[PDB]
Subunit: 494 residues, 4 copies
């Protein structure tokens, strides 16, 4: 049941949001955001820079000041506000679902039923954490009373990617606002629209000004300015592992601000011989092709037991070949366009490599439309560990199927990586399930499923997949400062 | 590798322990504790009464007075004391292993390698909990500072059975002492020796007088006294499903003191068709025959799938037929005698019942010795739910094997009981394992194992199997009082 | 700013609520519920007995069936529904505020701005706990995977008082429904109306039938039946210190069900010489007189240091003499009538006793109106520890003001009580505030404030003040079953 | 009770510790360690470089290999070893305390009763954590079983400063080893000796080889090697606020490893007029002069209310004049030498700096002995906020006393700092303490005490005092990896 979408929704916000006010870039410069389906320009947006960031950072600090409305306000009320924002976004659910599809290109039915469901659940989840994250009282030695304060970290720099525009915004705002922090958020130049409108609903929710500031622009400028700002207490970056090094390097060189990173991966989806064929075939397909393959934890490495390899591939190629590519607003469409031309050509260049590298091209491999950034659902067979496509994150509709024999083999090959964001195991065996979920060096291991995220379930990565987690209770840690207060008492008793 | 035991351990203690001092029964009355292997008197024991109990409560009450050494005592020092006690106990491990065997009858190997092993770990485990059970600080509405204190409940009465004299003493003292309570313990008339000697080590450990008081005697008097005393803040009793209520009523009529209970069961052992036969066979035998059948969580109902019944049964009979019964001090001895004659004829009585009821006796079924309380390992086959041996806890080396076809059937038959202390499933299938562990109404579900107890692993029970928990972090709850302190402050800030 | 009250609200529910269906008593018997403002009979109400409780429990048990909608419901969905209930309550806030006044007598202004406010926040608070109450994974010894399940406890009997009809029901339902339990609630005969109407909203919110069953009636009939029921897993009773015991034996003598008690007290309010007169006096007045003095934790023992005693006493009388008593619906009315004649004659009888005992009657001491159950704000001075009025909870608008000299002294006298529900200390000294806050044997200690409850803050009592606590995260414990699942794994690694 | 020390303790360890083996530098290079009391060379010590570090890292990685002794080791057993290690350290308490003063310069009496006491307390505390850091089970939406695993981070690099050689080592090893990590530790060129001797005990303790590896040497070499190594999973650096920056970038450019920082401070000690003068003055002296001024959290900023300033100043200057400087092995000595010549000149330059700035030198201000790096207890008065001595951490026995008027004023002046490690308030008023403990922007606030550290008490910092904390349960956060495991289940039920 998905409400009919407005295929050309009108855009109301396209500037810089500061102190619950809409501003032009200081420079007066703007950038265009494009429809990835047509290549056409949707509209112009304010191009924020250092001076816009400072303005935003000045607004946040003063809103984070002791005695300020936001700082004094009940922890319970912060959650009421978060619930309100949830209420209003739901009110604007059909519109936002269409605008997200318009700028990002993901099919509307997904935008409505998945992305916007997940946004509502995440904000409502964190509303419930607002007054339920407690510090401790500590039975310290001697005649002393010791307790801890879990205060907000402060002015939080937040940079999010384009693959899940709205839900990334929610994943960040949730714990930061539930914990009493203020935010200056940097949104992706490819998909800044839905976040700019939500800032409107942030305003409509009742949130005081300066608590959430969004500065649209470009990474190296706005993004870098935040990463370098001397009055920013923490920066959360989600995006290319390349810029990540940039963020951490600038961060130590600015003020030693608190830095958490959530980068890419090359997630292994391991199908053991005793797996349910039909189910593993469909979850494997979803695992890689979901969101036009542009998922942090896409199952881009399909290991299949040799005894079943041929059948699995067969069904996967059949499955892949049936995937409907086209208008995201068309109910039948399973896959919309790639986010942008650069990414578009990047994936094509990967496929090209895969071919020359010797991987067996079984289907797709080229452009799926003369218009927009469409790429055919591509499946490579007989993929090797050394192949470029089997090592580098493609972030596209390119499926990699590797052949293995034993469980000891797949663990080492799966774990032989610089990444460790996610992984999955398909098997009926209890000991196989447990062996693997323990042995795989991943921040998330799915068993007989894939891409199952819960508002209560954390999402963190290992190795070069970064640090820190998202969702669940763990999220509140990186947005909180712990203060210990140890008071001298007349005489301690148990 | 077990050190040669003293088959004739000398007993140093047989009096009443109050305020780190040994007292004579106020009545001057004593009773004999007897070796279940020979049936002769070990020694005379002070027979505590109400008058001795009152002494103990008064001694305890004073040790818990605000400002006392124990109450002013550092939380971490509390752990050192239990850790010291552990260290003292290890020093006397060989001595204590002999004494427990002498009074209880369990093989010296098990006493040394199992029972005492878990005593050290329980005490060492809870020693680490002493200063790590935190209170909270709560982001309450209004300009207030709210935090909780986890205070000791106060004077705690503890009644423990005879099947695990030392381990039970440790399960109870573990959470009690680490969390700062004081204790008046009543030990089993059948097995008082090891507990009395341990009180002595507590003396040497450095525990302030009154902190632990032990009053040997019988239930209706001593036990009743603790249960009825109007200055007893808590009473922890483990044992008969019958007497437990007496506690709930006797205490619920006195001063509404805290009562948690850990009572008997009829725990079902479910063997699925795809389980490892050899493993299942040896585990099922252990699950029921462990500690001469004298276990609360004995797998007293072995459910076996039709497809594997015959082979499982055959394998079961030989294993039991091979089980070595005799002098507990014999290295080769697998099973000692029942704790006393009352138990011995009682179990004899049950075996008889099955025979009449039509259960197929497959082995054992009679007395294995003309001296001591030895009973033959016995196996009943083709057992049906409605039989008495399938309904009442036998607490002896009598095995019940039931046959089933579907998992939905065994779920219902397994759950159709007044008990719910534990349960087990043996299977290689993941989905069965998850299904059964969830569907089963038991406090503890073992999968592909049995009697797997962790000091860190909690021990609770459903229905009439008792309330409250033992072991793990959950144990400290029942021995802690939560006091909320709410403070007015100038101006509340996040 | 309170909306105009409807002094004669219509009654829409007055029967027995089972399976979201309205039923008459099996016997078809009914009882009258009275307006304490006129004494006149408001309406007739179904008189539930054992037979009706059998009905409800059978509906509850079936609602708790494994595979049932309530059992299968997303934990997050349980939270959505509690939020739905609060929303519908908010829509009917003015109505419920008026029916609560008519049935109970409490001032309309208080019912609206306090009672239903706290009702709404409590429900919204626990809605957020719904999917945040986690079990643990345990690093147990050996090659095992051990974790716990925090399952619902099951069929929960809830017997609630009349002093906070709506808040009490919300206080019980919140955590219970949040942990996935099903409820059979016994409401006060004096106050059945507002809770029955909520029953309508429970149905309207979307709760599956049989998840909540409310059987209004009388204690010895309805109440005892619940307390003795063999298929009830837990009984939560709140009220009379006398009746509480009936519960503990009835349940301990029934099926070993889990039993929580919430009984009265005689909470000491300690005012030190260096306290703020203005603040202390106004709080000391509030502490006892709130809700017509019918609060379990009312500060019925006012200790005032000798140096400030007289000035305080003088001011307290003036304050109470000025307290406006009358029509609860009048904005200027400060104190309405007592809940009923039973309570009415009871407290007069207590005033009588206090006179005979030699307590200094300083104001009031009699009837405040010829119609209804109004009693004058009463103040007794020079109260002594041995006096009846200083030992038994009056639950009326009767204030006791005692004299003391040292901080060492008031602690002994304050803790010299059978109860331990609440306490308070008023002072500007840090060491005095900490010293007393620790040494006071009460589940709740207020500093420079009184009756400060946060839904996030637990509410429990010491000694004979009952067990467990209400509100907070500790509130989820009493409605949870801990299941331990320990699984054998190929090879354990850190 | 202090045992007389060995004033010329023998050195038994002086090389590089890898896999429980003592090795020479690859280069065979050594460096001399100096006695800061005599200025003479104590002995030669192996000078590790990149190559020696690479060896240690591989040996660390090897001990962390899945299926290794340390990885298979029971969490509770991990605790036995830490408890064992502490035991061995206690046994060598007098020797290690002598060596620390010899190498560090702090008074033996303090080394013995403070540092080594604290070292023991840290180890035994974290021993009890080993098996108490639980993961959680999470009520995720859908038919799934979701849980998280808290695995070790891996190879943990630890660079420690010289002011608390043994205590700093413990603070790092404790949490690291309790959670199952392996260590490659860099000890200070000034104070490598006692840390090396412990390595010997670690072996006698029984830790599997490679679990802890200690590399003596220099910062630009060993430290930089560790921070840049591609196989070190996390780097924790403690020391110079300047160097702290170098680590974060090298780590950002190396392998994006986890980096926690603990830098310098300029902690404000705020004395209110109503504080206890005598207590305040002796604590204020201690707050700064402890450990020859060489504490990151030194009360280097003493704010005194104008009404009591003159007397406080009067009292503090005398107190310092009476402070004994000399041979740390002489019991009467309160203050030994600074750690070295670098530190020695640094403090002289700072004392000169304040002199030039116009700060009133009230006592000391020069060299205190011709031999070794002894410096006169120095007290500056009428210090202004803009002065360098009021802004930069001197890390010497140099006291700065500032004057203030109101509580709101000192709050802004105190918080106006790049540091936020600690703070303290002296007052008898409840509202002032609570107001200030909340408003002070510090990782740790003391009330009426200073330098009160408990193993159970977390130790972190605000602003440019670094990230992450030490001690408490919060100390384990940095040494833990969170893995979420999400399993498809037949049908989820509560």
């Amino acid at each position: 049941a998905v409400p009919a979408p407005n295929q050309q929704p009108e855009v109301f916000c396209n500037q810089i949001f500061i102190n619950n006010e809409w501003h032009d870039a200081v420079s007066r410069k703007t950038f265009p955001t494009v429809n990835p389906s047509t290549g056409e320009v949707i509209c112009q947006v304010a191009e924020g820079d250092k001076e816009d960031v400072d303005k935003a950072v000045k607004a946040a600090r003063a809103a984070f000041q002791l005695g300020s409305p936001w700082r004094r306000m009940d922890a319970s009320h912060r959650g009421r506000l978060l619930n309100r924002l949830a209420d209003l976004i739901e009110r604007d659910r059909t519109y936002l679902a269409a605008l997200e599809t318009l700028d990002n290109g993901k099919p509307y039915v997904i935008s409505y039923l998945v992305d916007l469901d997940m946004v509502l659940k995440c904000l409502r989840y964190y509303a419930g954490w607002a007054d339920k994250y407690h510090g401790k009282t500590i039975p310290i030695d001697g005649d002393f009373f010791s307790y801890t304060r879990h205060e907000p970290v402060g002015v939080c720099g937040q940079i999010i990617p384009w693959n899940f525009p709205l839900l990334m915004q929610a994943w960040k705002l949730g714990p930061a606002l539930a914990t009493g922090n203020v935010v200056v958020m940097k949104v992706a130049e490819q998909t800044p629209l839905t976040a700019l409108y939500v800032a409107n609903l942030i305003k409509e929710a009742g949130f005081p000004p300066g608590v959430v500031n969004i500065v649209p622009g470009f990474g190296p400028t706005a993004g870098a300015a935040i990463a370098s700002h001397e009055d920013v207490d923490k920066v959360a970056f989600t995006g290319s592992t390349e810029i990540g090094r940039v963020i951490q390097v600038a961060a130590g060189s600015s003020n030693l601000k608190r830095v958490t990173l959530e980068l890419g991966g090359k997630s292994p989806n391991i199908i053991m011989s005793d797996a349910d064929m039909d189910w593993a075939v469909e979850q494997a397909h979803f695992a890689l092709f979901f969101n036009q393959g542009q998922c942090c934890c896409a199952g881009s490495r399909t290991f299949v037991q040799e005894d079943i390899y041929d059948e699995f591939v067969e069904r996967s190629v059949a499955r892949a070949k049936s995937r409907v590519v086209g208008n995201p607003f068309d109910s039948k469409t399973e896959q919309g366009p790639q986010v942008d031309e650069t990414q578009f050509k990047k994936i094509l260049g990967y496929i090209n490599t895969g071919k020359q590298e010797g991987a067996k091209l079984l289907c797709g491999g080229g452009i799926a439309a003369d218009r927009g950034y469409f790429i055919q659902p591509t499946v490579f067979g007989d993929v090797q560990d050394g192949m470029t496509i089997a090592k580098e994150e493609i972030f596209g509709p390119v499926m990699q199927i590797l052949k293995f024999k034993t469980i000891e083999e797949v663990v080492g090959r799966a774990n032989n990586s610089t990444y460790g964001l996610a992984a999955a195991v398909f098997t009926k065996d209890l000991d196989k399930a447990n062996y693997l979920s323990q042995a795989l060096q991943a921040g998330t291991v799915w068993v007989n499923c894939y891409d199952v995220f819960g508002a209560q379930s954390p999402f963190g990565g290992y190795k070069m997949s970064g640090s820190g987690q998202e969702l669940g209770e763990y999220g509140l840690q990186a947005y909180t400062e712990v203060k210990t207060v140890t008071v001298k008492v007349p005489q301690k008793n148990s």
